[PDB]
Design a protein around this nucleic acid. Sequence first.
RNA 1: CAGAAGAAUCAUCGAAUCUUUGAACGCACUGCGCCUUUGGGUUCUACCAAAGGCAUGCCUGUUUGAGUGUCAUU
RNA 2: AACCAUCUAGUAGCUGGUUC
RNA 3: AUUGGAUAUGCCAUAUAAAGCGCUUUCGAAGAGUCGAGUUGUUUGCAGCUCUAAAUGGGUGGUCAUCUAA
RNA 4: UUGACCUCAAAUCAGGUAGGACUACGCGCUGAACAAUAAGCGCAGGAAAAGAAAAUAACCAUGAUUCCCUCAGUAACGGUGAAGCGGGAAAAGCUCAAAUUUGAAAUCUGGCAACAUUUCUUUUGUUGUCCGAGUUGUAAUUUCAA
Lengths: 121, 166, 164, 362
Amino acid sequence: ALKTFELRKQSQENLAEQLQELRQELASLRVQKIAGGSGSKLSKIKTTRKDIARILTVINESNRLAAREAYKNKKYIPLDLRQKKTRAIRRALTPYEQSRKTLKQIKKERYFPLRKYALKA
Amino acid sequence: GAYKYLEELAKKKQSDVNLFLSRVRAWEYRQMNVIHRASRPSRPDKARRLGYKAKQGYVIYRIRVRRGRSARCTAEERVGRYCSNLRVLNSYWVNQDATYKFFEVILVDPSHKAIRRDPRINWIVNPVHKHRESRGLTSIGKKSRGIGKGHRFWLRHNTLSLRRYR
Amino acid sequence: LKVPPAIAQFQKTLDKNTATQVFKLLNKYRPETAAEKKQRLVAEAEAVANGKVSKKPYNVKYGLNHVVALIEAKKAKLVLIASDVDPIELVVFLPALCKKMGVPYAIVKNKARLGTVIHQKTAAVLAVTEVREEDKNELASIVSAVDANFSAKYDESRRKWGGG
Amino acid sequence: GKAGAARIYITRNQALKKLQLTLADFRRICILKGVYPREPKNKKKANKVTFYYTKDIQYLLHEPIVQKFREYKVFARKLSKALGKGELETAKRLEARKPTYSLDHIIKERYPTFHDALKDIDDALSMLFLFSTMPVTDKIGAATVANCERLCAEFQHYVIRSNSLRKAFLSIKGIYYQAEIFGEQITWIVPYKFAQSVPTDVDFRIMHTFLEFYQALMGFVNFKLYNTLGLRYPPKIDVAKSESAAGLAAYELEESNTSLFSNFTFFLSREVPRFSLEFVIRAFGGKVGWDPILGSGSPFSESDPVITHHICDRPHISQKYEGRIYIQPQWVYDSINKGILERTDLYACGATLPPHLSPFVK
RNA sequence: CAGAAGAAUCAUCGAAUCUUUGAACGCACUGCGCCUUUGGGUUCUACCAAAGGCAUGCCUGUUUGAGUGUCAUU
RNA sequence: AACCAUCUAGUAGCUGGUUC
RNA sequence: AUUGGAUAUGCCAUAUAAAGCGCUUUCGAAGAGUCGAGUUGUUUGCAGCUCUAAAUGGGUGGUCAUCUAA
RNA sequence: UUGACCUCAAAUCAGGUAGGACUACGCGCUGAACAAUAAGCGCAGGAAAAGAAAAUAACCAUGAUUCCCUCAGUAACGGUGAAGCGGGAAAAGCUCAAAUUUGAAAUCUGGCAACAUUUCUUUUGUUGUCCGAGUUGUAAUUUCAA
């Protein structure tokens, strides 16, 4: 099984060039197994499905990372490159605008803030 | 100021000036939709004291309801359904005739940044104010369910409270 | 239809000649634009940032609350009311308040024209409170014209129900 | 009906509807970019009128020319709004920040290589030369006319320095000059300086758009030629010399049979079109002198006896000198076209002018 | 049972993926489409395939055009 | 007219039963 | 590893500013198809319908007290 | 006429937002039978609602709301059935409209350009500039306790 470590230090075109070679290989084993396949064929399929998944991950990981870099310091970015969390969290007041106060209130907390004190018994 | 003159003129609702304007505008409002957007309030004194500011995020809507529940409560709810993305702030009476009562409803956009950055109307952005008119939290809604302070206005008396040591 | 006298008076506006002469004086006293105000303030900012007392400004007064307060203070020499305010009850008392305070007033056409003087889309009422010594005679001649072409004219017509 | 030849071509109204641009804007975009009508083989089938390929319309959908045109129109409306409202400062400030456009992308798309632009610059050179002498009118631009004249002067100076001119013919319409630059052959027509008048029959907007595109192509070609030859782009221009009608003398070529008349000092009086004669002499490597009436900055004078040939179309020479026998421009034009010096006696003043053979005619 | 030797039918878990529907949203509810872009191809103008999109109400703004409008307009 | 779910543990002076 | 309120300290600080207290030969705006009245329904409150206000006024209480709605 | 303003529309225009589900508790509307009853319908949150007196009292006076105990099975009513005081838990107060900034709309959204910042390349802002909103009124100031 190819490791993700050396699957992440090559370009996409050759990385996509590894996609179809694994695709027909998986397809070929299915042809062999329906005409008589040993236990290795079941594993060789099982190994190659995860192997196809591993390289598909690094294609999608790198493609998104390319999109994230391209849409850095942009005001509006695609919905895919955005936080999800929950729907209500995305609608709540941001911490900045929850901290907004009128200039009347700023003068209250500047001249008369809650003091730190103690009572001697 | 001019809102002192506007608000004392609004007490003489059947005077010559007010009666002519009531009948002229009632005909005009009937040619429009049942619920239609108002470019500016027809009572700038009354909207202003009910929380309306002439700024982005504040919307005035007119609605006519049939005469013959509370008329003002239904106007708030119908407009709230029509503009589902806005929060109903308040509402008031603008006009009436033999058949229809006309109301203007003040709505606030909880998603506009001019609302979310204004601490004086920042409270309406919180989810607890979703459809205030639907839960009887507006001015007329609170009055409808007899909310107030005084002798003029159940579960804790239909239950047996059995303590541990009794 | 039949209209009350307080609303009927707005159909009798100032004549074209007197209104054109009125706006010649008004256009001398336009408020400075947002750009001109910024240029004047940044110019004084450099004189402060590096290292360094004026006269009172002159402009036409605008705003409904502002102008009504100036009439009540008897500070306004000339009040020009728009003829087509969308809710008429906004200015329906202004001719009566100007009569009570002895303020020369006129009803001019195109509230948009009033707004153009003040670099705004729209103005309900303009008021000239006090002008430079050079324009004392020009304002005085206008006030006399408004007396004849608006107050002496109509007057008996403004107390009659219009329309019908 | 919905497929085949009908979809092959797009009608002018259909193409405008797809591009969402007005007829004038579409014409300007078509003139600025590369778009020509394409008549389908089956006109009846193509209509399911002018016909254009859908590929050109598809490319023109994302063209920034339409967006720039809207910005100019939108800004023009705002400038008109400020003038009407009475705030002159806002309109004056907004005038400086008015929108503009760049033709670098269009030139690269239309001409991927400099060879294609040079081969297609024959029309641009002719348009620039024709507009270099036209009077300033409301439809035309005074700055555009000055830019076209400067571009033509720079091209003439570059050709003279590189000796790229090959043939020069004197025609009724004007002077036809054939030059070889980077292998490509460029032909330009320079109209004579006469008191012409506006025909008031052609479209000025289309001509101005074509002239603007031609000027941009000429400027890009001149910059590339100057960089290749080491000349400074744009060349230095003397204001005092320009006001004195010095011609190419103002444009200094500062560095950043090509010798048919090299050993000759031609002199021209105020009776012949010295604008083309000086360029031909400069392209041949020789020295050309002009009278003070024709212009200032002349290296030589009339009284100077160093001039070997004196070009003068006048039939009388009261102040004729020795060693400066009068010659006619026909001999110079024939010599330039043929590459061999003609007979000065045959084309002497007061003699029959030999027929002028067109070098382009084979 | 089988299968791999950083293995595990493991745990944690911030990254990716997540078929058709469903508030379900191109129209329909099986199919029929629209626009745009991209590409095929040995069939290259086009066609075809795929992708991107294409619900409604309402709020803020942008752009465009109408008006029976108010004027401005010697 | 029918069917289904809940109110419902609805209503009983009466019936049967009610544990070494 | 991610965070919160403090402490210490460096830098910056648009203070020509902004506040509390004190004093008066000067002033002091207060929410209407609402309150309220009649009448008809729902469960006094609320709702409809007809009418429709005031300015030491108005509300609720025992001349007085208390409160200051829309 | 140009041109401003007001409209009335349009756009597969940019940025947003609503629906459905859960529903023990919560807030409205509606409603029979044997009671704000079940149902039916509408709408939320981690709590909700209520809430800084158009409140009690008749005292040497109390002092927003909510919950618990008590008052009390009392007054009153016609079996239903509170509340003031009193004792506890917890405590926090405030914001507008109505005033001329008038010696200067001092206010705000957005586009664009940089600079930051992050639960986060996903987040959230700052500065500059232009446009728009706004004088039919956005800031500062004031809320009767003044």
